[PDB]
Protein backbone atom coordinates (compact mmCIF):
# COMPACT_ATOMS: atom_id res chain seq x y z
CA UNK A 1 0.00 0.00 0.00
CA UNK A 2 2.78 2.54 0.77
CA UNK A 3 4.63 0.89 -2.13
CA UNK A 4 1.73 1.44 -4.38
CA UNK A 5 1.44 5.15 -3.45
CA UNK A 6 5.17 5.62 -4.08
CA UNK A 7 5.07 3.77 -7.43
CA UNK A 8 2.17 5.92 -8.53
CA UNK A 9 4.05 9.19 -8.07
CA UNK A 10 7.48 8.07 -9.14
CA UNK A 11 7.31 9.19 -12.79
CA UNK A 12 5.97 12.65 -11.90
CA UNK A 13 8.22 15.65 -12.28
CA UNK A 14 7.77 18.90 -10.44
CA UNK A 15 8.79 22.53 -10.62
CA UNK A 16 8.41 24.64 -7.50
CA UNK A 17 8.93 28.34 -6.71
CA UNK A 18 9.46 30.90 -5.20
CA UNK A 19 10.13 30.74 -1.46
CA UNK A 20 12.77 29.08 0.60
CA UNK A 21 14.13 30.17 3.93
CA UNK A 22 15.33 28.94 7.26
CA UNK A 23 12.49 28.32 9.76
CA UNK A 24 13.89 28.87 13.25
CA UNK A 25 11.45 27.00 15.49
CA UNK A 26 10.66 27.65 19.17
CA UNK A 27 8.56 24.99 20.99
CA UNK A 28 6.77 27.18 23.46
CA UNK A 29 6.19 26.10 27.04
CA UNK A 30 3.87 27.81 29.60
CA UNK A 31 6.80 29.60 31.14
CA UNK A 32 8.18 30.87 27.78
CA UNK A 33 4.90 32.64 27.12
CA UNK A 34 4.54 33.87 30.71
CA UNK A 35 8.00 35.41 30.40
CA UNK A 36 7.14 37.10 27.11
CA UNK A 37 3.96 38.77 28.51
CA UNK A 38 5.67 39.69 31.84
CA UNK A 39 8.24 41.86 29.97
CA UNK A 40 5.33 44.28 29.32
CA UNK A 41 2.51 45.98 31.15
CA UNK A 42 -0.35 43.46 30.63
CA UNK A 43 -2.68 46.40 30.00
CA UNK A 44 -0.42 47.51 27.05
CA UNK A 45 -0.68 44.02 25.58
CA UNK A 46 -4.52 44.06 25.77
CA UNK A 47 -4.62 47.56 24.18
CA UNK A 48 -2.25 46.54 21.41
CA UNK A 49 -4.40 43.37 20.73
CA UNK A 50 -7.40 45.75 20.32
CA UNK A 51 -5.44 47.56 17.59
CA UNK A 52 -4.61 44.30 15.79
CA UNK A 53 -1.26 45.21 14.24
CA UNK A 54 -0.76 43.74 10.80
CA UNK A 55 2.96 44.39 10.88
CA UNK A 56 5.42 43.87 13.71
CA UNK A 57 7.36 47.13 14.27
CA UNK A 58 8.27 46.58 17.94
CA UNK A 59 8.25 43.54 20.21
CA UNK A 60 4.86 44.50 21.75
CA UNK A 61 3.23 44.01 18.32
CA UNK A 62 4.61 40.44 18.31
CA UNK A 63 3.47 39.60 21.79
CA UNK A 64 -0.02 40.95 21.04
CA UNK A 65 -0.44 38.85 17.89
CA UNK A 66 1.10 35.72 19.48
CA UNK A 67 -1.37 35.91 22.40
CA UNK A 68 -4.15 36.40 19.93
CA UNK A 69 -3.05 33.23 18.00
CA UNK A 70 -2.87 31.16 21.21
CA UNK A 71 -6.19 32.50 22.49
CA UNK A 72 -8.14 31.96 19.28
CA UNK A 73 -6.23 28.75 18.50
CA UNK A 74 -5.56 29.91 14.94
CA UNK A 75 -2.38 30.09 12.88
CA UNK A 76 -1.09 33.43 11.61
CA UNK A 77 1.83 34.86 9.66
CA UNK A 78 2.77 38.48 10.32
CA UNK A 79 5.60 40.42 8.73
CA UNK A 80 8.34 42.31 10.55
CA UNK A 81 9.95 45.61 9.70
CA UNK A 82 13.66 45.23 8.88
CA UNK A 83 15.22 47.40 11.65
CA UNK A 84 18.19 46.25 13.75
CA UNK A 85 16.74 46.74 17.25
CA UNK A 86 13.79 44.52 16.50
CA UNK A 87 15.86 41.81 14.69
CA UNK A 88 18.18 41.66 17.73
CA UNK A 89 15.34 41.37 20.25
CA UNK A 90 14.19 38.33 18.27
CA UNK A 91 17.74 36.81 18.26
CA UNK A 92 17.85 36.80 22.09
CA UNK A 93 15.09 34.17 21.88
CA UNK A 94 16.42 30.60 22.19
CA UNK A 95 15.20 28.51 19.22
CA UNK A 96 15.04 24.75 19.49
CA UNK A 97 15.79 23.85 15.84
CA UNK A 98 16.40 25.25 12.38
CA UNK A 99 14.88 23.59 9.32
CA UNK A 100 13.93 24.19 5.70
CA UNK A 101 11.11 26.69 5.48
CA UNK A 102 9.01 28.15 2.68
CA UNK A 103 6.60 26.26 0.47
CA UNK A 104 9.04 25.66 -2.37
CA UNK A 105 11.70 24.43 0.09
CA UNK A 106 9.40 22.14 2.08
CA UNK A 107 7.69 20.69 -1.00
CA UNK A 108 11.07 20.17 -2.74
CA UNK A 109 12.44 18.29 0.22
CA UNK A 110 9.29 16.19 0.56
CA UNK A 111 9.20 15.20 -3.07
CA UNK A 112 12.98 14.40 -2.99
CA UNK A 113 12.37 12.23 0.06
CA UNK A 114 9.53 10.49 -1.73
CA UNK A 115 11.92 9.87 -4.70
CA UNK A 116 9.92 11.28 -7.59
CA UNK A 117 11.72 11.41 -10.96
CA UNK A 118 12.61 15.08 -10.94
CA UNK A 119 12.30 18.26 -8.90
CA UNK A 120 13.36 21.68 -10.11
CA UNK A 121 13.31 24.36 -7.39
CA UNK A 122 13.84 28.04 -7.93
CA UNK A 123 14.41 30.68 -5.34
CA UNK A 124 16.46 33.87 -5.73
CA UNK A 125 18.74 33.51 -2.68
CA UNK A 126 20.75 30.34 -2.28
CA UNK A 127 23.49 30.67 0.32
CA UNK A 128 25.49 27.65 1.33
CA UNK A 129 23.66 27.31 4.66
CA UNK A 130 20.33 27.48 2.85
CA UNK A 131 21.37 25.01 0.16
CA UNK A 132 22.55 22.51 2.75
CA UNK A 133 19.11 22.34 4.30
CA UNK A 134 17.88 20.71 1.08
CA UNK A 135 17.60 16.94 0.98
CA UNK A 136 20.53 15.16 -0.68
CA UNK A 137 19.02 13.83 -3.89
CA UNK A 138 20.64 13.86 -7.32
CA UNK A 139 17.35 14.79 -9.06
CA UNK A 140 16.55 17.78 -6.85
CA UNK A 141 17.81 20.53 -9.16
CA UNK A 142 18.32 24.27 -9.28
CA UNK A 143 18.41 26.26 -12.59
CA UNK A 144 21.58 28.28 -13.32
CA UNK A 145 22.77 30.17 -16.40
CA UNK A 146 26.42 29.45 -17.30
CA UNK A 147 27.87 30.97 -20.51
CA UNK A 148 24.43 31.70 -21.82
CA UNK A 149 23.17 28.10 -21.32
CA UNK A 150 20.67 26.62 -18.86
CA UNK A 151 22.29 24.24 -16.35
CA UNK A 152 20.18 22.22 -13.89
CA UNK A 153 22.43 21.55 -10.98
CA UNK A 154 21.98 19.52 -7.79
CA UNK A 155 20.64 22.14 -5.44
CA UNK A 156 23.03 21.41 -2.59
CA UNK A 157 26.01 22.27 -4.90
CA UNK A 158 24.41 25.31 -6.58
CA UNK A 159 24.97 27.84 -3.77
CA UNK A 160 26.58 31.21 -3.98
CA UNK A 161 27.37 34.16 -1.72
CA UNK A 162 23.78 35.23 -1.23
CA UNK A 163 22.11 36.58 1.87
CA UNK A 164 20.06 34.20 4.08
CA UNK A 165 16.37 34.70 5.00
CA UNK A 166 15.17 33.58 8.45
CA UNK A 167 11.60 33.23 9.59
CA UNK A 168 10.68 32.54 13.19
CA UNK A 169 8.14 29.91 14.00
CA UNK A 170 6.40 29.83 17.42
CA UNK A 171 4.87 26.41 17.97
CA UNK A 172 2.41 25.72 20.75
CA UNK A 173 0.33 22.77 21.80
CA UNK A 174 -3.20 22.27 23.03
CA UNK A 175 -3.07 22.67 26.83
CA UNK A 176 -0.39 25.38 26.92
CA UNK A 177 -1.39 27.97 29.50
CA UNK A 178 -0.40 31.27 30.98
CA UNK A 179 -1.83 34.34 32.73
CA UNK A 180 -2.59 37.70 31.14
CA UNK A 181 -4.13 40.54 33.17
CA UNK A 182 -5.67 38.05 35.66
CA UNK A 183 -7.15 35.72 33.02
CA UNK A 184 -5.73 32.27 32.56
CA UNK A 185 -5.52 31.59 28.84
CA UNK A 186 -5.37 27.98 27.64
CA UNK A 187 -4.58 26.89 24.09
CA UNK A 188 -7.43 24.78 22.65
CA UNK A 189 -5.48 23.80 19.49
CA UNK A 190 -1.93 22.98 18.53
CA UNK A 191 -0.71 25.40 15.85
CA UNK A 192 1.98 28.01 15.13
CA UNK A 193 2.52 31.72 14.77
CA UNK A 194 4.96 32.88 12.08
CA UNK A 195 7.09 35.97 12.18
CA UNK A 196 7.75 36.67 8.53
CA UNK A 197 10.84 38.36 7.23
CA UNK A 198 10.49 40.27 3.93
CA UNK A 199 14.01 41.39 3.17
CA UNK A 200 14.10 44.48 0.95
CA UNK A 201 16.51 42.88 -1.59
CA UNK A 202 14.62 39.54 -1.98
CA UNK A 203 12.04 39.68 -4.74
CA UNK A 204 9.36 37.18 -5.48
CA UNK A 205 10.44 36.59 -9.05
CA UNK A 206 12.39 34.52 -11.48
CA UNK A 207 15.47 36.62 -12.35
CA UNK A 208 15.95 37.58 -16.06
CA UNK A 209 18.77 35.10 -16.69
CA UNK A 210 16.73 32.01 -15.79
CA UNK A 211 13.36 33.52 -16.81
CA UNK A 212 14.33 33.30 -20.51
CA UNK A 213 14.32 29.46 -20.05
CA UNK A 214 10.97 29.06 -18.17
CA UNK A 215 9.28 27.48 -21.20
CA UNK A 216 12.06 24.81 -21.36
CA UNK A 217 11.74 24.26 -17.59
CA UNK A 218 7.98 23.72 -18.06
CA UNK A 219 8.66 21.11 -20.75
CA UNK A 220 11.03 19.32 -18.39
CA UNK A 221 8.24 18.81 -15.73
CA UNK A 222 4.61 17.66 -15.38
CA UNK A 223 3.38 20.22 -12.89
CA UNK A 224 4.23 23.24 -10.81
CA UNK A 225 3.64 24.05 -7.11
CA UNK A 226 3.73 27.82 -6.63
CA UNK A 227 3.70 29.99 -3.55
CA UNK A 228 5.56 32.82 -1.81
CA UNK A 229 3.27 35.62 -3.03
CA UNK A 230 2.55 36.22 0.66
CA UNK A 231 5.89 38.03 1.07
CA UNK A 232 5.33 40.58 -1.77
CA UNK A 233 5.30 44.19 -0.46
CA UNK A 234 3.13 46.99 -1.84
CA UNK A 235 6.23 49.15 -2.43
CA UNK A 236 9.98 48.73 -2.55
CA UNK A 237 12.38 51.66 -2.00
CA UNK A 238 13.67 51.34 -5.61
CA UNK A 239 10.15 52.13 -6.85
CA UNK A 240 9.07 48.62 -7.78
CA UNK A 241 5.61 47.75 -6.53
CA UNK A 242 3.40 44.69 -5.87
CA UNK A 243 1.76 45.17 -9.27
CA UNK A 244 5.10 44.77 -11.10
CA UNK A 245 5.77 41.40 -9.37
CA UNK A 246 2.25 40.17 -9.78
CA UNK A 247 2.10 40.99 -13.54
CA UNK A 248 5.44 39.26 -13.88
CA UNK A 249 4.31 36.20 -11.86
CA UNK A 250 1.14 35.82 -13.95
CA UNK A 251 3.32 35.86 -17.00
CA UNK A 252 5.60 33.22 -15.37
CA UNK A 253 2.64 30.88 -15.28
CA UNK A 254 1.99 31.40 -19.04
CA UNK A 255 5.73 30.93 -19.78
CA UNK A 256 5.74 27.68 -17.86
CA UNK A 257 2.76 26.52 -19.91
CA UNK A 258 4.15 27.82 -23.21
CA UNK A 259 5.53 24.59 -24.70
CA UNK A 260 3.71 22.06 -22.48
CA UNK A 261 0.41 22.49 -20.71
CA UNK A 262 1.58 21.38 -17.27
CA UNK A 263 -0.73 21.53 -14.27
CA UNK A 264 -0.14 24.42 -11.88
CA UNK A 265 -1.09 24.78 -8.22
CA UNK A 266 -1.38 27.82 -5.99
CA UNK A 267 -0.84 27.34 -2.29
CA UNK A 268 -2.46 30.06 -0.30
CA UNK A 269 -1.12 31.31 3.01
CA UNK A 270 -1.97 33.74 5.83
CA UNK A 271 -1.48 37.15 4.05
CA UNK A 272 -1.57 40.06 6.48
CA UNK A 273 -1.91 42.80 3.85
CA UNK A 274 -5.34 42.64 2.30
CA UNK A 275 -4.18 44.39 -0.94
CA UNK A 276 -1.56 41.71 -1.57
CA UNK A 277 -4.14 39.05 -0.70
CA UNK A 278 -6.42 40.48 -3.34
CA UNK A 279 -3.68 40.47 -5.92
CA UNK A 280 -3.01 36.73 -5.31
CA UNK A 281 -6.66 36.12 -6.22
CA UNK A 282 -6.73 38.46 -9.24
CA UNK A 283 -3.40 37.54 -10.78
CA UNK A 284 -2.56 33.96 -9.66
CA UNK A 285 -5.75 32.08 -8.61
CA UNK A 286 -7.30 33.06 -11.99
CA UNK A 287 -4.52 31.23 -13.88
CA UNK A 288 -3.91 28.00 -12.02
CA UNK A 289 -5.49 24.55 -12.22
CA UNK A 290 -5.32 23.70 -8.52
CA UNK A 291 -5.57 25.68 -5.32
CA UNK A 292 -4.80 24.69 -1.74
CA UNK A 293 -6.24 26.59 1.22
CA UNK A 294 -7.16 26.13 4.83
CA UNK A 295 -10.63 27.15 5.97
CA UNK A 296 -9.68 30.68 6.87
CA UNK A 297 -7.97 31.08 3.49
CA UNK A 298 -11.04 30.04 1.49
CA UNK A 299 -13.15 32.38 3.63
CA UNK A 300 -10.71 35.15 2.81
CA UNK A 301 -10.87 34.42 -0.92
CA UNK A 302 -14.66 34.33 -0.82
CA UNK A 303 -14.71 37.71 0.92
CA UNK A 304 -12.43 39.19 -1.77
CA UNK A 305 -14.92 37.83 -4.37
CA UNK A 306 -17.82 39.55 -2.59
CA UNK A 307 -19.35 36.51 -0.81
CA UNK A 308 -19.30 38.15 2.61
CA UNK A 309 -22.10 36.27 4.31
CA UNK A 310 -20.84 32.80 3.22
CA UNK A 311 -17.28 33.68 4.14
CA UNK A 312 -18.29 34.92 7.61
CA UNK A 313 -20.40 31.77 8.13
CA UNK A 314 -17.37 29.68 7.28
CA UNK A 315 -15.24 31.55 9.82
CA UNK A 316 -17.98 31.29 12.44
CA UNK A 317 -19.19 27.69 12.16
CA UNK A 318 -16.79 25.75 9.88
CA UNK A 319 -19.70 23.80 8.29
CA UNK A 320 -18.46 21.47 5.66
CA UNK A 321 -21.56 22.33 3.62
CA UNK A 322 -20.50 25.96 3.50
CA UNK A 323 -16.91 25.09 2.52
CA UNK A 324 -18.25 22.93 -0.30
CA UNK A 325 -20.53 25.79 -1.46
CA UNK A 326 -17.52 28.07 -1.49
CA UNK A 327 -15.47 25.62 -3.55
CA UNK A 328 -18.23 25.42 -6.12
CA UNK A 329 -18.27 29.21 -6.37
CA UNK A 330 -14.56 29.14 -7.16
CA UNK A 331 -15.01 26.40 -9.80
CA UNK A 332 -17.83 28.38 -11.40
CA UNK A 333 -15.92 31.66 -11.28
CA UNK A 334 -12.53 30.30 -12.53
CA UNK A 335 -12.81 28.12 -15.63
CA UNK A 336 -9.09 27.16 -15.59
CA UNK A 337 -9.48 25.76 -12.12
CA UNK A 338 -9.96 21.97 -12.09
CA UNK A 339 -9.68 21.20 -8.38
CA UNK A 340 -10.38 23.13 -5.20
CA UNK A 341 -8.60 21.73 -2.17
CA UNK A 342 -9.35 22.71 1.42
CA UNK A 343 -7.55 21.29 4.43
CA UNK A 344 -8.48 21.70 8.12
CA UNK A 345 -7.39 19.90 11.26
CA UNK A 346 -10.32 17.49 10.70
CA UNK A 347 -10.13 16.72 6.94
CA UNK A 348 -8.82 17.37 3.50
CA UNK A 349 -11.40 17.99 0.76
CA UNK A 350 -11.33 17.98 -3.02
CA UNK A 351 -14.10 19.60 -5.08
CA UNK A 352 -14.06 19.02 -8.84
CA UNK A 353 -16.47 19.25 -11.78
CA UNK A 354 -18.18 16.02 -12.95
CA UNK A 355 -16.28 16.33 -16.23
CA UNK A 356 -12.96 15.83 -14.40
CA UNK A 357 -11.20 12.78 -15.95
CA UNK A 358 -10.80 11.21 -12.46
CA UNK A 359 -13.49 9.30 -10.62
CA UNK A 360 -14.51 10.13 -7.10
CA UNK A 361 -12.58 7.00 -5.92
CA UNK A 362 -9.40 8.20 -7.67
CA UNK A 363 -9.81 11.61 -6.02
CA UNK A 364 -10.18 9.79 -2.69
CA UNK A 365 -6.92 7.89 -3.26
CA UNK A 366 -5.09 11.23 -3.67
CA UNK A 367 -6.46 12.46 -0.35
CA UNK A 368 -5.86 9.24 1.50
CA UNK A 369 -2.19 9.39 0.37
CA UNK A 370 -1.94 13.00 1.45
CA UNK A 371 -3.38 12.30 4.90
CA UNK A 372 -0.71 9.62 5.49
CA UNK A 373 1.98 12.17 4.74
CA UNK A 374 0.45 14.80 7.00
CA UNK A 375 -0.12 12.53 10.00
CA UNK A 376 3.43 11.10 9.69
CA UNK A 377 4.81 14.62 9.70
CA UNK A 378 2.57 15.66 12.65
CA UNK A 379 3.87 12.65 14.68
CA UNK A 380 7.56 12.89 13.85
CA UNK A 381 7.97 16.55 12.97
CA UNK A 382 9.63 15.61 9.64
CA UNK A 383 9.34 12.95 6.96
CA UNK A 384 12.95 11.74 6.54
CA UNK A 385 12.31 8.43 4.73
CA UNK A 386 9.50 6.66 2.87
CA UNK A 387 9.55 4.07 5.59
CA UNK A 388 8.40 6.76 8.13
CA UNK A 389 5.01 6.70 6.42
CA UNK A 390 4.13 3.60 8.44
CA UNK A 391 3.69 5.97 11.40
CA UNK A 392 0.91 7.85 9.70
CA UNK A 393 -0.72 4.64 8.61
CA UNK A 394 -0.99 3.50 12.29
CA UNK A 395 -3.04 6.61 13.25
CA UNK A 396 -6.76 6.06 12.78
CA UNK A 397 -9.11 8.50 11.01
CA UNK A 398 -10.42 11.04 13.57
CA UNK A 399 -13.80 10.30 15.21
CA UNK A 400 -15.75 12.88 13.13
CA UNK A 401 -14.63 11.13 9.93
CA UNK A 402 -17.45 8.86 8.83
CA UNK A 403 -19.70 11.77 9.64
CA UNK A 404 -17.84 14.49 7.67
CA UNK A 405 -17.32 12.03 4.84
CA UNK A 406 -21.01 11.09 4.79
CA UNK A 407 -22.05 14.76 4.67
CA UNK A 408 -19.62 15.74 1.94
CA UNK A 409 -20.34 12.60 -0.11
CA UNK A 410 -23.96 13.56 -0.51
CA UNK A 411 -22.79 16.60 -2.61
CA UNK A 412 -21.59 14.27 -5.37
CA UNK A 413 -24.07 14.80 -8.15
CA UNK A 414 -24.24 15.24 -11.91
CA UNK A 415 -22.27 18.49 -11.78
CA UNK A 416 -19.58 18.05 -9.09
CA UNK A 417 -17.31 15.32 -7.74
CA UNK A 418 -16.45 15.56 -4.03
CA UNK A 419 -13.89 13.54 -2.03
CA UNK A 420 -13.05 13.90 1.62
CA UNK A 421 -10.38 12.20 3.71
CA UNK A 422 -10.68 12.64 7.50
CA UNK A 423 -7.43 13.56 9.18
CA UNK A 424 -5.49 10.97 11.13
CA UNK A 425 -5.18 13.23 14.14
CA UNK A 426 -2.36 13.06 16.65
CA UNK A 427 -3.12 14.73 20.04
CA UNK A 428 0.40 15.95 20.78
CA UNK A 429 1.98 16.74 17.43
CA UNK A 430 5.69 17.36 17.38
CA UNK A 431 5.19 20.42 15.16
CA UNK A 432 2.66 21.96 12.80
CA UNK A 433 4.56 24.27 10.48
CA UNK A 434 4.46 22.91 6.92
CA UNK A 435 1.70 20.36 7.50
CA UNK A 436 -0.47 22.15 4.94
CA UNK A 437 2.32 22.30 2.37
CA UNK A 438 2.89 18.60 2.92
CA UNK A 439 -0.77 17.67 2.48
CA UNK A 440 -1.40 20.03 -0.43
CA UNK A 441 1.67 19.00 -2.41
CA UNK A 442 1.01 15.31 -1.75
CA UNK A 443 -2.58 15.52 -2.91
CA UNK A 444 -1.67 17.64 -6.00
CA UNK A 445 1.23 15.46 -7.12
CA UNK A 446 -0.95 12.39 -6.70
CA UNK A 447 -3.75 14.10 -8.66
CA UNK A 448 -1.35 14.99 -11.51
CA UNK A 449 0.02 11.42 -11.39
CA UNK A 450 -3.39 9.78 -11.80
CA UNK A 451 -4.40 12.16 -14.58
CA UNK A 452 -1.29 11.29 -16.57
CA UNK A 453 -1.62 7.61 -15.90
CA UNK A 454 -5.20 7.71 -17.21
CA UNK A 455 -4.27 9.81 -20.29
CA UNK A 456 -2.22 6.74 -21.55
Ligand SMILES: Nc1ncnc2c1c(I)cn2[C@@H]1O[C@H](CO)[C@@H](O)[C@H]1O
Pocket residue numbers: 190191343344345346347348371374375378379422423424425426427428429432435436439
Ligand atom coordinates in the same frame (compact mmCIF):
# COMPACT_ATOMS: atom_id res chain seq x y z
N1 LIG B 1 -2.24 17.36 15.29
C1 LIG B 1 -2.41 17.00 13.88
N2 LIG B 1 -2.30 15.67 13.81
C2 LIG B 1 -2.43 14.97 12.62
N3 LIG B 1 -2.67 15.61 11.46
C3 LIG B 1 -2.73 16.97 11.56
C4 LIG B 1 -2.62 17.65 12.73
C5 LIG B 1 -2.74 18.99 12.59
I1 LIG B 1 -2.63 20.55 14.08
C6 LIG B 1 -2.95 19.15 11.23
N4 LIG B 1 -2.96 17.90 10.62
C7 LIG B 1 -3.07 17.45 9.30
O1 LIG B 1 -2.38 18.63 8.46
C8 LIG B 1 -3.23 19.06 7.57
C9 LIG B 1 -3.05 20.60 7.45
O2 LIG B 1 -3.69 21.33 8.43
C10 LIG B 1 -4.64 18.62 8.09
O3 LIG B 1 -5.54 18.48 7.08
C11 LIG B 1 -4.34 17.29 8.82
O4 LIG B 1 -4.39 16.11 7.94
Ligand SMILES: OC[C@H]1O[C@H](O)[C@H](O)[C@@H](O)[C@@H]1O
Pocket residue numbers: 021023077100101102103106167168194196230269433434435436437
Ligand atom coordinates in the same frame (compact mmCIF):
# COMPACT_ATOMS: atom_id res chain seq x y z
O1 LIG C 1 4.10 26.38 5.05
C1 LIG C 1 5.05 26.79 5.99
C2 LIG C 1 5.86 27.94 5.42
O2 LIG C 1 4.93 28.88 5.00
C3 LIG C 1 5.02 30.23 5.28
O3 LIG C 1 4.36 30.99 4.29
C4 LIG C 1 6.29 30.81 5.95
O4 LIG C 1 6.72 32.00 5.37
C5 LIG C 1 7.43 29.83 6.11
O5 LIG C 1 8.22 30.29 7.18
C6 LIG C 1 6.95 28.41 6.37
O6 LIG C 1 8.03 27.51 6.27
Ligand SMILES: [Mg+2]
Pocket residue numbers: 268269270294436437
Ligand atom coordinates in the same frame (compact mmCIF):
# COMPACT_ATOMS: atom_id res chain seq x y z
MG1 LIG D 1 -0.88 26.72 4.66
